[PDB]
From a paper:
To better understand RelP at the molecular level, we determined the crystal structures of RelP homologues from S. aureus (Sa) and B. subtilis (Bs) at 2.25 and 3.3 Å resolution, respectively. Both, SaRelP and BsRelP form highly symmetrical and oval-shaped homotetramers with a prominent cleft in their centers highly reminiscent of BsRelQ. The (p)ppGpp synthetase monomers of SaRelP and BsRelP are highly identical and consist of a mixed β-sheet build by five β-strands (β1–β5) that is surrounded by alpha helices (α1–α6). Another interesting observation is that the loop connecting β3 and β4, which is disordered in the structure of BsRelQ, could be resolved in both structures of RelP. Inspection of the amino acids of the G-Loop reveals the presence of proline in RelP proteins with no correspondent in RelQ. We hypothesized that the absence of this proline in RelQ renders the G-Loop less rigid, while its presence in RelP results in a well-ordered G-Loop that might easily facilitate GDP/GTP coordination. SaRelP was incubated together with 5 mM ATP and varying concentrations of GDP or GTP (Of note: BsRelP exhibited no (p)ppGpp synthetase activity under our assay conditions for unclear reasons).
Author numbering:
A (entry chain D): 15 to 44, 48 to 74, 82 to 209
B (entry chain C): 18 to 44, 48 to 74, 83 to 209
C (entry chain A): 16 to 44, 48 to 74, 82 to 209
D (entry chain B): 16 to 44, 48 to 75, 83 to 209
Write the structure that this text describes.
Amino acid sequence: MEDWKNELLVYKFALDALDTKFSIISQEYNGHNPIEHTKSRVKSFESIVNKLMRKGCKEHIHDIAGVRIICSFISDIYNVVNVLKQHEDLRIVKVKDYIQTPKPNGYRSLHLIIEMPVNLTNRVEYVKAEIQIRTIAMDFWASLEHKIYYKLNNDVPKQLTDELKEAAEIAHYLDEKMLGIKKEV
Amino acid sequence: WKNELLVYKFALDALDTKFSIISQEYNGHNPIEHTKSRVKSFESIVNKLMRKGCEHIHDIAGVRIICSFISDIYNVVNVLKQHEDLRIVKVKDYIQTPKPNGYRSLHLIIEMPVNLTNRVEYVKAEIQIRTIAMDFWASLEHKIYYKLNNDVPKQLTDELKEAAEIAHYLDEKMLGIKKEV
Amino acid sequence: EDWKNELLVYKFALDALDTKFSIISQEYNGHNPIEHTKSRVKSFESIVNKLMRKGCKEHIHDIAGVRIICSFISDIYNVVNVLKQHEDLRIVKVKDYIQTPKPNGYRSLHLIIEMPVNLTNRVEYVKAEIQIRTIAMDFWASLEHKIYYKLNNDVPKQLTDELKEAAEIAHYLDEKMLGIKKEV
Amino acid sequence: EDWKNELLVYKFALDALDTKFSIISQEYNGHNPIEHTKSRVKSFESIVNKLMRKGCEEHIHDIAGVRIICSFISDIYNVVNVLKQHEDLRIVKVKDYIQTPKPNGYRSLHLIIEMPVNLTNRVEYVKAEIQIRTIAMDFWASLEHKIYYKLNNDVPKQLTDELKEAAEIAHYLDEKMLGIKKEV
């Protein structure tokens, strides 16, 4: 419907606001910042419905506004998470530390759903957003697995999924080994 | 002084998305064409503070909203009043009561919360809302006074006042033509 | 089909022209006259309505359009004089609507060029129409379009006459504002 | 004295190269291998410190530097073959540090080019060094430089050896991660 242009637009505003917050977060480290790139994605209404096609057509979907913070090191992930707690204009509703507690896919990230106030002209709206904080190799393994499942439509053999598992054992072992090298300085 | 001016830099970066969003509620036409933010330098602060004793200066962070029509100027003012995350401290409508210079604008100092890591700071910023010709007449006068160092002959100032008297009659006429649509 | 391939070369040329004007202005920072540069690749629908006078042929010049908004009238011709001293573009056509304005009051300085674009395949020579204007010229044009657009070409004489008045003054302004700079 | 003009053309060359890589990726809108492009004009100071092997006061190549960071190893050479089919740049030198890596573990594909820059005065033929890398290559390089900076070129043996171990894996990753795309 066209009640959808108005509400989905509010979610776009929240992302523009988060960009300056994450720009400011690194600008308090300008003495080094771990946030290298940040990719924000508002869901395309239909993907909402196809995911809502599991339920009934509701404002309980968290990844309407999604942001991926890609940090340099694992230690830098939790540093941003702990920093986001000391901010008032957003409260952490949920947090899922898939690092150390990964999925059977090998998938590792640190998701956290927030409640975001958006100052508009009429009044204020409180929208939810799910932030996914990852290292470099974590965002690349995730983007790769998705692009594989996209072409093959969920029908992936065991060896191909097992290969993806090996890449996760390494990418974390990589991010682990690369972390200990920074620790020496 | 390194850290404190940075908070003012964050305040302007935050307003840019606010003005970007205000224009996206008209996507049925938006009046804000360009927006130029200028954080004043350390040296400019002191020389202007040289009239008192060494953060009560408001235009530390300055924003210029250049609107298309005069009517759109007050619409941004009325929009900024229905906002909670900033409160209007002062308002100077140099339109309708302009300076003897011919200078016309609508300045308004606000108090802006800046969410940092430790806590929040409430900083002041001066927003200067203008039409196109107001920003061009202002930018020209400043560049004249800059080259001549405040020593401007009377004839040159009279034309600038004349140039301002006309530019408003322009912005007035161009507004009434839009009204017919 | 092959409309996607040809329209992209026109989009690419603007990306190439965009850096040329960024470089042109970075050679005058000792003051540069270029305040805005807005590139607009023409819309597929607008092309047809303009092509509806011919047959659905690359003789439409403003497929890639750039608006140079300069501070003063004197600043316009300096960009023209700079654009003449470039090899990788040759001026094909020139229409000085300043001093020779239309009856609507429209004033600008258009000049069609031919631009080489080095691509992967080889190089393509496309046409672009550059429109150099002052601040008030770009605003009077943008306003007239928005008026004719809403009223669908049916605009009374009184409304156009006001527009005639509005254009005659803004130039007298741009002239008066020009002469004030001369004294400095 | 007038270092200002000659160093400035290197800034202009990147503005032109930036659109070439922006346009190269727009010819793949059917998949693009170029993820980000970062242009770095060398710092007035670094030129001299780099010149400390010769005599102070244009045979230093990386004055204008561009890093194409690709997703996979196969995507690197696709950019190389695309850059060969362009006329407005000729490859002077090519160093494939992949397959022939350094003893520190550094891996990339460097190639110095010669770029014509159309300016207002005339055209200048400048050199630029493009470094094409995967994701892990740019991160390992950024790590090694940040280490040598803190330790002032004085790095112990284990740290250099660990970095090679860290490098031996990241490429074995980029190799394994490459074949997974091939199965699709």
